[PDB]
Amino acid sequence: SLLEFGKMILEETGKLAIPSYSSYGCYCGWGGKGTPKDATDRCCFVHDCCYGNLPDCNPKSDRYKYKRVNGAIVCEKGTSCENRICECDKAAAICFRQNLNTYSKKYMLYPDFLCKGELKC
Numbered sequence: 001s002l003l004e005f006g007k008m009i010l011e012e013t014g015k016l017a018i019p020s021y022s023s024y025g026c027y028c029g030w031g032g033k034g035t036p037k038d039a040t041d042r043c044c045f046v047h048d049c050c051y052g053n054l055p056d057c058n059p060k061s062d063r064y065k066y067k068r069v070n071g072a073i074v075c076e077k078g079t080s081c082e083n084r085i086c087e088c089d090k091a092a093a094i095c096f097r098q099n100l101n102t103y104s105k106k107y108m109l110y111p112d113f114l115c116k117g118e119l120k121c
């Protein structure tokens with residue numbers, strides 16, 4: 001669910017999902033069009049694609065369970081939708097973690113008209 005993914009992002013990064021990632025660039029949160037601005041945005045693009053692979057699942061509301069096994073996120077057994085949503089969100093959090101070194105506040109609240117360039121999943 002949206003709230004769980006926000007917790008997973010805070011644990012990984014130390015940044016609150018809202019407002020650090022909720023409006024970042026051309027793909028994070030509401031959005032998803034044009035050429036991703038940077039590596040963090042590419043994380044959101046992949047995440048957006050990952051959700052798109054699951055048209056009959058509801059990632060905002062569906063709650064999954066996960067644990068930590070060496071500080072590592074480990075998705076636990078639930079429904080097939082919940083399992084698949086978890087793996088999507090786990091990849092995004094890790095991706096954000098991996099790219100904190102290039103995170104830029106200038107891409108926060110990025111303008112929609114500046115998101116141009118087709119990019120398929």
Ligand SMILES: CN(C)Cc1c[nH]c2c(CCCO)cccc12
Pocket residue numbers: 002003005006007009017018021022023027028029030044047
């Ligand atoms: C409670 N709810 C309002 C939280 C929320 C809104 N947008 C979010 C994003 C967007 C980052 C990925 O697209 C990530 C994690 C949580 C949120």
